[PDB]
Design a protein around this motif. Structure first.
Motif, short mmCIF file in Angstrom:
data_model
loop_
_atom_site.label_atom_id
_atom_site.label_comp_id
_atom_site.label_asym_id
_atom_site.label_seq_id
_atom_site.Cartn_x
_atom_site.Cartn_y
_atom_site.Cartn_z
N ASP A 40 -56.41 47.20 -37.56
CA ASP A 40 -57.35 47.61 -38.59
C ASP A 40 -58.41 48.58 -38.06
O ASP A 40 -58.28 49.19 -37.00
CB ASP A 40 -57.95 46.38 -39.28
N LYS A 41 -59.48 48.79 -38.83
CA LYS A 41 -60.55 49.76 -38.64
C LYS A 41 -61.90 49.15 -39.05
O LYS A 41 -62.94 49.51 -38.52
CB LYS A 41 -60.27 51.03 -39.47
N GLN A 42 -61.87 48.22 -40.00
CA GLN A 42 -63.01 47.46 -40.48
C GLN A 42 -63.15 46.22 -39.61
O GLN A 42 -64.24 45.95 -39.11
CB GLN A 42 -62.82 47.09 -41.96
N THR A 43 -62.05 45.48 -39.40
CA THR A 43 -62.10 44.21 -38.67
C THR A 43 -61.59 44.39 -37.22
O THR A 43 -61.88 43.56 -36.37
CB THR A 43 -61.36 43.14 -39.50
N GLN A 44 -60.91 45.51 -36.91
CA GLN A 44 -60.28 45.80 -35.61
C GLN A 44 -59.35 44.68 -35.13
O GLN A 44 -59.39 44.27 -33.96
CB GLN A 44 -61.33 46.18 -34.55
N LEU A 45 -58.49 44.17 -36.02
CA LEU A 45 -57.55 43.10 -35.71
C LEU A 45 -56.12 43.62 -35.78
O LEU A 45 -55.84 44.54 -36.55
CB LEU A 45 -57.68 41.95 -36.72
N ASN A 46 -55.23 42.96 -35.04
CA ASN A 46 -53.78 43.13 -35.18
C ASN A 46 -53.39 42.65 -36.58
O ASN A 46 -53.83 41.57 -37.00
CB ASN A 46 -53.03 42.31 -34.12
N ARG A 47 -52.53 43.37 -37.31
CA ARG A 47 -52.06 42.97 -38.65
C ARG A 47 -51.10 41.77 -38.65
O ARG A 47 -50.85 41.21 -39.71
CB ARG A 47 -51.35 44.14 -39.35
N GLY A 48 -50.54 41.38 -37.50
CA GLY A 48 -49.53 40.34 -37.41
C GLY A 48 -48.12 40.88 -37.16
O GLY A 48 -47.16 40.10 -37.25
N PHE A 49 -47.98 42.15 -36.79
CA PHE A 49 -46.68 42.78 -36.57
C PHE A 49 -46.82 44.03 -35.72
O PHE A 49 -47.60 44.91 -36.10
CB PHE A 49 -45.97 43.07 -37.90
N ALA A 50 -46.14 44.12 -34.56
CA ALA A 50 -46.19 45.29 -33.67
C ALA A 50 -44.89 46.07 -33.68
O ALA A 50 -43.83 45.46 -33.72
CB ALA A 50 -46.50 44.91 -32.21
N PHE A 51 -45.00 47.39 -33.60
CA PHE A 51 -43.87 48.31 -33.64
C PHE A 51 -43.51 48.72 -32.21
O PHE A 51 -43.89 49.78 -31.73
CB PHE A 51 -44.23 49.50 -34.55
N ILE A 52 -42.79 47.84 -31.50
CA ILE A 52 -42.14 48.15 -30.24
C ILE A 52 -40.94 49.05 -30.53
O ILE A 52 -39.92 48.59 -31.06
CB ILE A 52 -41.82 46.86 -29.45
N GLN A 53 -41.10 50.34 -30.27
CA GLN A 53 -40.04 51.34 -30.31
C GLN A 53 -38.97 51.02 -29.27
O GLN A 53 -39.22 50.28 -28.33
CB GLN A 53 -40.70 52.71 -30.10
N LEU A 54 -37.78 51.60 -29.41
CA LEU A 54 -36.67 51.41 -28.50
C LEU A 54 -36.29 52.69 -27.77
O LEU A 54 -36.97 53.71 -27.88
CB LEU A 54 -35.47 50.82 -29.28
N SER A 55 -35.21 52.63 -26.97
CA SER A 55 -34.53 53.78 -26.41
C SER A 55 -33.56 54.41 -27.43
O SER A 55 -33.40 55.63 -27.40
CB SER A 55 -33.84 53.34 -25.12
N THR A 56 -32.94 53.64 -28.33
CA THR A 56 -32.27 54.19 -29.51
C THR A 56 -32.35 53.23 -30.71
O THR A 56 -32.47 52.00 -30.57
CB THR A 56 -30.79 54.54 -29.26
N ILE A 57 -32.09 53.79 -31.89
CA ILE A 57 -31.71 53.12 -33.12
C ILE A 57 -30.54 52.14 -32.95
O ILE A 57 -30.39 51.24 -33.77
CB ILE A 57 -31.34 54.17 -34.19
N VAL A 58 -29.69 52.37 -31.95
CA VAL A 58 -28.55 51.52 -31.62
C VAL A 58 -29.05 50.34 -30.79
O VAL A 58 -28.90 49.20 -31.23
CB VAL A 58 -27.44 52.30 -30.89
N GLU A 59 -29.66 50.58 -29.62
CA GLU A 59 -30.05 49.53 -28.68
C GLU A 59 -30.93 48.48 -29.36
O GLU A 59 -30.83 47.31 -29.01
CB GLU A 59 -30.81 50.11 -27.48
N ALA A 60 -31.73 48.87 -30.36
CA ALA A 60 -32.57 47.94 -31.11
C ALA A 60 -31.75 46.77 -31.66
O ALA A 60 -32.16 45.62 -31.51
CB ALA A 60 -33.29 48.70 -32.22
N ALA A 61 -30.59 47.04 -32.28
CA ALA A 61 -29.77 46.00 -32.88
C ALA A 61 -29.18 45.05 -31.83
O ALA A 61 -29.00 43.86 -32.10
CB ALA A 61 -28.65 46.62 -33.72
#
Length: 89
Positions: A40-61
């Motif tokens: 956030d920006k008002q409360t500066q908290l984590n929303r409850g979900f992080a976007f850990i990117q991968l090496s591919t769209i494939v390796e994620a699965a």
């Protein structure tokens, strides 16, 4: 579906992303320039979900059926990190 990213759901508002990072990224080659708990920006908290990117769209699965088979059950702030895909259209 996978969008080259796995949503670390249950991401507690005061968990250190840094202890979560390697604990959910043995193969995703990240450090800082991906680490987005939609925070956030008002409360500066984590929303409850992080976007850990991968090496591919494939390796994620595939990582979604490797990672949990390794290491102990991750639980920081009494929240088990959930293991969802970055579904966005």
């Amino acid at each position: 579906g996978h969008m080259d990213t796995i949503i670390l759901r249950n991401l507690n508002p005061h968990s250190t992303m840094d202890s979560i990072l390697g604990a959910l990224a043995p193969y995703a080659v990240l450090s800082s320039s991906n680490v987005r708990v939609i925070k956030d920006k008002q409360t500066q908290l984590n929303r409850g979900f992080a976007f850990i990117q991968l090496s591919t769209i494939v390796e994620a699965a595939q990582l979604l059926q490797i990672l949990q088979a390794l290491h102990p059950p991750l639980t920081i702030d009494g929240k088990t990190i959930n293991v969802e895909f970055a579904k966005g259209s």
